Paper text:
S. pneumoniae produces up to three distinct sialidase enzymes: NanA, NanB, and NanC. NanC is an unusual sialidase in that its primary reaction product is 2-deoxy-2,3-didehydro-N-acetylneuraminic acid (Neu5Ac2en, also known as DANA), a nonspecific hydrolytic sialidase inhibitor. NanC adopts the same overall topology as seen in NanA and NanB, with a CBM (residues 85–271), followed by a catalytic domain (residues 272–740). The catalytic domain adopts the canonical glycoside hydrolase family 33 sialidase, six-bladed β-propeller fold shared by viral, bacterial, and mammalian sialidases.
Structures of NanC have been determined with Neu5Ac2en, 3F-β-Neu5Ac, and OC bound at the catalytic active site. Thus, many of the Neu5Ac2en to NanC interactions are also conserved with NanA and NanB. These include an arginine triad, comprised of Arg-290, Arg-600, and Arg-662, which orients the ligand in the active site via electrostatic interactions with the Neu5Ac2en carboxylate. The ligand sits on top of the catalytic pair of Glu-584 and Tyr-695 and beneath the general acid base Asp-315. The latter residue is substantially closer to the C2 of Neu5Ac2en than in NanA or NanB Neu5Ac2en complexes: 3.2 Å in comparison with 4.2 and 4.5 Å, respectively (Refs. 23 and 24). The most significant structural change observed upon binding and/or formation of Neu5Ac2en is the substantial shift in Phe-316 and Phe-396 of the hydrophobic pocket and the loop upon which the latter resides (herein named the 396 loop, residues 392–401). The Cα of Phe-396 advances 2.1 Å into the active site, and the side chain changes conformation, moving out of the active site to accommodate the ligand. The net result of the movement of the 396 loop is that it partially constricts the active site. The movement appears to be stabilized by hydrophobic interactions between Phe-396 and the C9 carbon of Neu5Ac2en because no hydrogen bonds or other stabilizing interactions are formed between the residues of the 396 loop and Neu5Ac2en. When short Neu5Ac2en soaks were performed, the CBM binding site was empty, whereas bound Neu5Ac became apparent when the soaking time was increased.
Numbering used by the authors: 84 to 471, 474 to 740
Write the structure that this text describes.
């Protein structure tokens, strides 16, 4: 039970003195403080409460919990005369605003002198726990004599003044246990996660959300389940999915849809300290960066990049497709252990052929890229990961030997591929993966997918899938309803990571909106359903760092102000992946777009990285996004940071 509980304390920087109420309550010196609050203004560093020695000379003798204007939650515990200064925090811990209202958050700190740890909670997640050698509790700090809500009294003056309402605050004179505080901090914000740390996927981390609405009214999601922290590479990554049959109100428990089992789908506590955060899982095959489209016959397609163990965007050979052409057919090539050349091909029925004799061997490759010998699977030992400093070790479980694995008898060229799977039941079940043929040419690697959706161009029925090479756009398309694939390769002005998404403006007229390396969003126009493309133009109202970020843009089915509309989601800040905005663009008779409305998702300094939009069956808009800066090295390996939210068009008109 609490030693003090206060309510509805509204403050504009001035604080409230609770010294009488708390002096003498903290007999051990340990504490837990649970704060339900909303901010009226996010600017500046703000303390939810402060326990201090307030006398002259003692300004570095206090304990607080604080909020920053970027959503970071932290705590300090400091003592002047011993020059001890503890700081524990996690970025991207709270929400600011949502549809014009201050968001209620619930945060907590626990100081446990027996464990010498400080822990912080926010909205049902333990965002950080840190053992510190210079531990300080209230009793360790010399001359504590002032206890304040909404500030810290330093040398007779209020510092870090809070602006908002403390809805409820509880002080306890002991360290409460993990499960209790998680539960006390659960609130509405907790319910915005579709994918959560250590859910059914077994992953602690997620990136790259995709939302898509099927013609039956199902709203479908996919995501990268990233097991070895949030690194793009090297990593062990599966694609997970989850769906809603009620306009997004409730979602299925995630399922694994594309996954390799050379490593198991198990939760790892990836180190966030500078000394460990660069660590990667290096020996494991992966699927990464998903694209969803629904065909006109209602079959659903999902594409993803395929990385063999040890391969990524960084390491993949650019000068080999991994295919060989033999008698006009293209066959995936293989190198056998102990050979220097690639002497083998996978041909009809998955039969592995020795290219030197042009005869079938006793080996074959199954529909999931697993290897058999005389009809029986070959196996290898699965890896697990251990920390103490990281080890990847053989764990004694047998999985099928696979051509994408580190320990295979036959291996593919160490480059990146694309695979696609199809579903005839709106994503309850999926075919085995098909690898894309060497559409870029035999002597070039596959392109890299632009995460989000593809489209069906309405006048031709052409299926378009966005991708990029690092130097060109690669618009993968089919003119036979997905039976065969070709590509339009478009050289770009510079080395853009050209993650793109399409809209259709009018029949036969499409635009590709994409990331660049120059700070702007580019759009290229085709008036022949993607066969030829204009020179790039640039949006004038978004200004981002040079590296860029993925965007989402969709067609919307309903008129807005009497006009056909598109809806765009992007960060908009030169300071980082921040300041999420949703823009409404109304299409004019002449196919120019009037970018008439924008909505700021949260405050400007709050994190906003990869995103995905979909129109719900009821004509509201669903948004999932990375609510953190996914470029920053300081925001790596964070749990429960990819929420789902919804807007009415009337919400999006405001800002
Ligand atoms: C396949 C892959 O690596 N995709 C990643 C992509 C890529 O590395 C970059 O575009 C190279 O320039 O970058 C990012 C990113 O947050 O910036 C995330 C993607 O998942």
């Amino acid at each position: 039970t609490p030693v003090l509980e206060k309510n509805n304390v509204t403050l504009t920087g001035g604080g409230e003195n609770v010294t009488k109420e708390l002096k003498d309550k903290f007999t051990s010196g340990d504490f837990t403080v649970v704060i339900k609050y909303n901010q009226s203004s996010e600017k500046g560093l703000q303390a939810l409460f402060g326990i201090s020695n307030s006398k002259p000379g003692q300004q570095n003798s206090y304990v607080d919990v604080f909020l920053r204007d970027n959503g970071e939650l932290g705590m300090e515990a400091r003592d002047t005369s011993s020059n001890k200064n503890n700081l524990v925090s996690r970025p991207a811990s709270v929400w600011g605003k949502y549809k014009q209202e201050a968001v209620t958050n619930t945060v907590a700190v626990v100081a446990d002198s027996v464990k010498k740890t400080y822990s912080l909670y926010a909205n049902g997640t333990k965002v950080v726990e840190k053992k510190v050698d210079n531990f300080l509790n209230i009793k360790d700090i010399k001359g504590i004599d002032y206890y304040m809500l909404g500030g810290v009294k330093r040398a007779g003056k209020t510092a870090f003044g809070f602006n908002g309402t403390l809805e409820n605050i509880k002080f306890f004179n002991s360290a409460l246990d993990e499960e209790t505080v998680k539960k006390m901090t659960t609130n509405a914000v907790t319910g915005h996660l579709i994918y959560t740390a250590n859910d059914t996927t077994g992953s602690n981390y997620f990136r790259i959300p995709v939302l898509y609405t099927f013609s039956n009214g199902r709203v479908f999601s996919s995501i990268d389940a990233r097991y070895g922290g949030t690194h793009d590479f090297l990593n062990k990554i599966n694609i997970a999915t989850s769906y809603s049959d009620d306009n997004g109100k409730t979602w299925t428990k995630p399922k694994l849809t594309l996954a390799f089992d050379d490593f198991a789908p198990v939760p790892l506590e990836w180190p966030r300290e500078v000394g460990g955060r660069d660590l990667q899982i290096s020996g494991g095959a992966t699927y990464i960066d998903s694209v969803i489209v629904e065909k006109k016959n209602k079959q659903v397609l999902m594409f993803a990049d395929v990385m063999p163990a040890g391969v990524s965007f960084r390491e993949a050979t650019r000068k080999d497709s991994g295919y060989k052409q033999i008698d006009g057919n293209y066959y995936l090539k293989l190198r056998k252990q102990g050979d220097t050349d690639y002497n083998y091909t996978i041909r009809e029925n998955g039969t592995v052929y020795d290219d030197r004799t042009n005869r079938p061997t006793e080996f074959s490759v199954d529909k999931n890229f697993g290897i058999k010998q005389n009809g029986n699977y070959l196996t290898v030992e699965q890896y697990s990961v251990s920390f103490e400093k990281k080890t990847e070790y053989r764990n004694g479980t047998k999985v099928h030997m696979n051509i994408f694995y580190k320990d295979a008898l036959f291996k593919v060229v160490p480059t990146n591929y694309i695979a696609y799977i199809s579903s005839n039941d709106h994503g309850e079940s999926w075919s085995a993966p098909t690898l894309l043929p060497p559409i870029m040419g035999l002597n070039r690697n596959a392109p890299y997918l632009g995460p989000g959706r593809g489209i069906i161009e309405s006048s031709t029925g052409r299926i378009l899938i966005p991708s990029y090479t690092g130097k060109e756009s690669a618009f993968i398309y089919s003119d036979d309803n997905g039976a065969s694939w070709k590509v339009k390769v478009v050289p770009l002005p510079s080395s853009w990571s050209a993650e793109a998404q399409f809209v259709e403006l009018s029949p036969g007229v499409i635009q590709a909106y994409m990331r660049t390396n120059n700070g702007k969003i580019a759009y290229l126009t085709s008036k022949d359903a993607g066969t030829t493309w204009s020179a790039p133009e640039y949006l004038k109202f978004v200004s981002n760092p040079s590296y860029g970020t993925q965007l989402s843009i969709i067609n919307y089915s309903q008129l807005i102000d009497g006009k056909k509309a598109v809806i765009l989601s992007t960060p908009n800040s030169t300071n980082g992946r921040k300041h999420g905005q949703i823009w409404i663009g109304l299409i004019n008779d002449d196919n120019t777009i009037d970018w008439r409305y924008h909505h700021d998702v949260d405050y400007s300094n709050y994190g906003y990285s990869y995103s995905t939009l979909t129109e719900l069956p009821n004509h509201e808009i669903g948004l999932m996004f990375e609510k953190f800066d996914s470029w920053s090295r300081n925001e790596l390996h964070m749990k429960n940071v990819v929420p789902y939210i919804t807007f009415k068009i009337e919400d999006l008109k405001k800002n």
